[PDB]
């Protein structure tokens, strides 16, 4: 049986996800976290501001 | 005033009574059995003092992890114990420990506030006598929070959190590279 | 924007790597710092061979060999990264004076034009 | 008082009760007839158990007040989890037992 | 919480009269206890002149 | 602050007069780090919200790694796992 | 078909916790009077519910029925 | 690194003393500083209470 | 109470143990009566000796018999 | 031991207040808001400006801001008595889950804005507000069994 | 004062009588699952076997010269006191609105489920047998390694909660049926839940006669019924704890009881009924959960310690750290964070 | 840019074939390029030594601390070259030890300080027993661990009392509090003696020394120098107690006598361990100062380069012995290296100039370390401590010259037939040439630190 081998990355991700896949599908979640966290600044398109508060002491 | 519920705070007598066991045990591990009793008495103290949160933290992480790890080691490669505090092993004990207990009592006295005398040494021992603190009422506390403010400070002082990330990193890499012995 | 009235203070120039937040300050900011650069943008390229100069540092690691094998890629990454920090160490400043000061020519105008933030 | 202190006080006495029932009426009459070894994976598992507990203790106030730290506590804890997950990618490479005796080399003749 | 903050002056003023009326009355009680020998009951412990709260009371 | 100084001092001079059992010394040195927190927590309670209790959660998280390195180093007080020796 | 015997222990394991929940509900409405029960709104009912105890029992809507401000409570406790 | 304290109210009137450089006047902050100290430990409060209970003891 | 639960410990030496585990078979089930045997001579009540008994076994059998409650 | 101190006196230099009543004022919380808001603001402003110098806004604002709330609760005890009463009666159950009585809310608010012509201005422009008719949310569990007939009849008669 | 002690007696007799008949229940359902019939003979119907077995196995009580009685006479009482019973101090949704618990729920349950582990370890410490205590260290090691990934997942499901008192999770979860419908890692919680309270398909330290004809120590007598009752009670507690947070209490027919109680009762007749159906909801969410424990008892065989540590420290835990690289991420992305 | 280097090469040591002699070449060249392209912060460093603070708790003092971390980088580059050119997988924790040391040289406030001293100490506990197939290291590591634990809780108890008297933590808030409540002084000397575990002040004396002789020589170079500079650089960066108010002066009196009275030693490691102890005791004397850091900043480098140098010289002297000691530790006796001048006597010349360094003959080091030390002393007025420092220098010079007098007597039978062992020779030649040519540029630094 064959492990993963780096030098062909399109091949590596294949024969990682097919022979020792159980860390692949973890790290797919690990890349779905922050990369999708960077594809939101257009995707919220200024959706909402939460607007919470402690006590509003006002001005003169 | 529910007479015992006022001296339920003074549980320090059980603390010193457990710690006098903790250094004179029979077996090497009946001591660390008593150590978790020391920690749960500390948790009882912290719940009584107004912070049950850190009581439950100590129950979760000290007798949940590190005392479990003391018991975990003391099964395997058990060290050769001297039997107990024999009188020949209580030799040169009193002759320095009495003076050391006196000097450390004076150190606890040196934790006192500002007096350049021995008056502050007696002042902290009478600290409960002239005083019982007065609580107050809620002036504009909007949201309920006990350890939430701890994380607020952990956001303000974020850099020590990102550095104790490194100390937990060391806590896992060290025991790899000191016991695994790669081939 | 993007957060509350809380503030994040960071005037960072050290050996522990940091960055900047969205905005509220007078010092160097996050996204403007990668821009307003110069022809020193190949300074990160100058390090890009320097950690790839470890092959030149190989004066007989083993006996009678050279050209350390293809982990130089890793070195190349570090040859980028430190130099990137060195490019990010080219905070000339954010709108101070008494320096090279192209910021009053290439970033005074942006603070002029963007008159709504 | 009066709420659950009754439970944590009643229960030890119930434990001593169902213990101390049969200490008396069970027949005893006790007649007669009534260093070590190791592995790295028997020890390093519990050693490395502890830091991954108390990083959860680190994470627990953050998950208590996830709010009041918006857009920024997320960033800090993502950096914290990055610094921890690289420790995980260190320890994935090594921790397993090794079967000592299984040989396969080809056989030669003169 | 907005609901609660609209209640927040009111309730605090509910206490404030109390922390006027509890404070000076305690001081008057101690005027009765410390009379005879001249003494600084009628004196702030805090050297800044601004009103504080009494604390650490013996019951 | 009697409650923390007394357990600290007794752990300390237990660590002095410990002519038996290396691990009782080791756990007395552990219990120093919870004799100090009973000082720290009640000083924070007598003061305020989170100023010293932040240092308390720090010293708990770090006392874990203390005991971890102490065990994983005490394992190597000898040869490793087990062989012939003397 | 279904096991007529085997679901009888599940029937009593259902009924025991069922009666155990109903008894908690009854004993808390008898504890509190004919109302539901409050959760921990920490630091806040000890302003609010304590104030209700300083005035009345249960709840009331009026102007004020205090006397010596209905005897303003002040908590005190020993030094640690 | 100073949460919403029960002694925060004496930072400002200590720090506004050290707003100007009167820590090199070296005494202008000492009323402010020891009022900060009495917020910390209530020492002269406690001596005042010990005095009045000693007067209580002689009746 | 003693007559109801009634669990043994298997000693189970030969063919007669095959019939003993046929009593754990679904046709003539043990658990319709309560017989739920543990593999431990202290947690046991009765000690079914099944199979033939060698000369070699018998001290082990009596040692099992002694570590068994009254 | 959290023992209670319960001393008594009365201090001279001002006219005494009138206190307020129980947790049912949580129903009336917005109702004192828009009316007594500048009184509130001037009170807390005068408190914050006198740095440490409390106990001097008592005679001006500590009396004034309570006078306004006493006036508001007297107006609501004459205007919508039982409409207030069933609403806080709902609201003392359900843990003061203020979502948990949002149908008798509309009855009480319509009655107030009818007779005492106030509102509930929750400040913030982005979302929708008090009429939500929830539709992905945590509406109620026990839907105020003495009060569902009330909002049903208000849908019926009005 | 009198009402709460009769409250606590009702709740204790519920849990004790419950865990008594639970063993008969599981043996019956194994038996029908094993194509036979369970205890069908005891006394009056056949619901009574454990209730006679408890009186049976009291009256044995041996001690062993290889071990101090002072530890093993108390260590199964330890896990009987703490692991079994005072886990119910949190009143793990005592299924109404109300509880017998003040507040600060989930990490108390964490602390006591953590506290049981050296109750197992010191139990196995006994008798000084060089083949025994290594098996004890095995048991406790796998026990803590799955404690960790109970812990690190029910702290991440409360990231949709952020409030640490017990009820607020439950009132939060009634809108979505939040528990499993938004996330199916319930199942790995379930496969974590068989390990940290080992009534498992793992059976791992129950190498019953692979050792010298004894597995744990064979501390038979009152410590046996203590260990037995505490294991089953830890099972129904952690099963309730599953039905507490990551499976839901407060079934949606009580949400629809707005369309039912308003058609049934007039106005608050002593709250007579709703706590009962709420208890019915939580009970049927709890026993249907442990029916899968009684499945997995008799479906898949033991699980091979080295592969068990493989199953902890290699697969489930990095999937887990991915899964709370996204549940902070995805709610931050989609709209926003939760308040408290 | 150290954290990025750590997280990079912990991933690089993962999935490595345990060659593990190349990764240090990458770390050496990476620290070299990082210093070469990160020295550009010296222009933005100081107009008038303007400090810069990270988030209120961390301090960047651009004249002092920006030189200290440059020295740390320098000696780390030297150690990393010393492992190149017998090893296990360890440079990850070398770098994180550096991270801790640099945090304590940048730590404004005690939370960062305590985290980082404990991180640093954990690194020392680990590095002591990486070479786990020893009986020396096994004992020494556990001894270092237990006493570092005692001294750690001494740290934390000092600062907890400091918090008990003042609700702040920062020494920035100490701000010349001249009413000087006496417990503030006692807390501060307790914190001083707590941080002074590493110097092994004469009541805390012996325990470090058995640890130094029970580590391999490739390790005892590293931890006779890292915390030696680290905790003291913190201790001079903030001047805790302006004078001693006789507490610390007594500690250094019994040190600089009672560690130089440790004269007769036959073990090499003990000998230069006492050397590195007493020369660390030297720079404690200007912990007793105020507004004085130039002598300290110069004395660190103009000691530590030569300390590194003498360890590298007795590294080179393994090749010439005709006996060795244990697998981990080659050369422990002085009398092992007898006739070294009849071997390659250029290194005997280097050993000569770096020991004449430590005795302080004028034209290379001692008239620029000890001269600045003595002018900092006699600026304050500590007249007695001057003459006891002089006695310390003479009696230290005696066992210093013990090494040169055993170095160049006469060889029994060894001259010459060999192969070569080089390309790290430029490191030792760089340290020796910078030792004996600092008298050239001994005035440029005097202007540069006058402008910083
Ligand atoms: C999404 C697309 C991204 C495109 C980006 C485009 C931008 C262009 C920039 C160009 C630079 C390229 C950067 C890529 C670096 C990838 C590293 C690599 O692949 O080296 C392979 C190499 C594998 O070793 P090998 O011996 O050559 O392969 C042997 C076998 O074939 C077996 O080899 P293997 O395949 O099994 O290797 C295992 C590897 C899996 O193999 C992979 O590389 C898959 C990773 C795919 C990319 C995901 C990571 C990139 C995301 C950004 C960096 C996150 C970290 O697992 C990991 O190493 C995980 C890395 C850490 C992730 C957590 O790794 C190394 O030897 C060491 C290199 C590590 C240097 C990188 C350090 C940078 C990390 C930055 C962290 C920032 C921390 C900030 C903290 C701030 C505190 C205040
Ligand atoms: C975040 C935490 C979640 C997972 C991280 C946990 C560790 C994963 C890293 C890892 O396991 O790498 C090692 C593995 C090969 O290691 P191995 O050879 O088995 O070593 C054993 C030798 N005894 O290497 C592997 O094969 C497992 C890692 C595979 C994952 C590779 C990256 C997948 C991510 C997909 C995004 C790729 C980015 C480019 C996408 C193209 C553009 C759309
Ligand atoms: C994507 C959108 C959503 C995003 C959120 C994602 C949430 C998803 C929910 C969680 C994901 C589920 C992950 C399940 C983890 C299980 C992984 C696993 O078991 O790996 C198999 C592994 C095999 O062993 P090994 O030989 O080492 O594998 C290498 C082979 N080359 O290990 C093993 O040895 C197998 C042992 C498993 C033991 C299980 C025993 C029976 C359990 C069945 C009872 C559960 C059924 C009841 C609940 C179901 C309710 C519907």
Residue numbers in the entry:
A (entry chain g): 4 to 63
B (entry chain 6): 2 to 184
C (entry chain X): 4 to 120
D (entry chain 3): 1 to 34, 49 to 124
E (entry chain W): 63 to 121
F (entry chain L): 1 to 86
G (entry chain D): 2 to 81
H (entry chain 9): 9 to 67
Relevant lines from the article:
Respiratory complex I is a ~1 MDa membrane protein complex with key functions in aerobic energy metabolism. Fourteen central subunits are conserved from bacteria to mammals.
The final model of 42 subunits was 88% complete and contained 7515 fitted residues. We identified density for all expected 28 accessory subunits of Y. lipolytica complex I. In the membrane arm we detected density for a new accessory subunit with a single transmembrane helix (provisionally labelled X in Figure 8). In our map only residues 35 – 48 in the central part of the long TMH1-2 loop of subunit ND3 were disordered. However, this can now be excluded, as in our cryo-EM structure of Y. lipolytica complex I no inhibitor was present.
